Amino acid sequence: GQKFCFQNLVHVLQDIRYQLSFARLRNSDLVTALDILSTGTSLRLANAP
């Protein structure tokens, strides 16, 4: 039971780290958004042969 305690704690810590990535928000990619205003992904075309 004591071991189970250790492990269980690790799993809870991982889980809350997961929720952590779920809670942050990142600055918008306006570039891609403006390209999609004009309905293409200008990036993926120019770049690609």
């Binding site: 990142r26 990619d29 306006l30 205003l37 004009s38």
Partner: protein, 54 residues
């Protein structure tokens, strides 16, 4: 003959230079092959932010 040929080559190069400069000034280009509201823009970009990001 050699002097006179040199003179002709030089004159040819002078007409070269003048046409070169006129065609440089007139830069020749091929022909070219909506406005946005920022709100819908910003919301869309922030949506996209998680999905275009690692």
């Amino acid at each position: 003959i050699s002097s006179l040929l040199k003179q002709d080559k030089e004159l040819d190069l002078q007409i070269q230079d003048c046409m070169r400069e006129m065609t440089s000034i007139y830069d020749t280009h091929l022909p070219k092959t909506q406005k946005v509201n920022a709100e819908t823009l910003l919301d869309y970009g922030r949506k996209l932010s998680k999905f275009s990001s690692a």
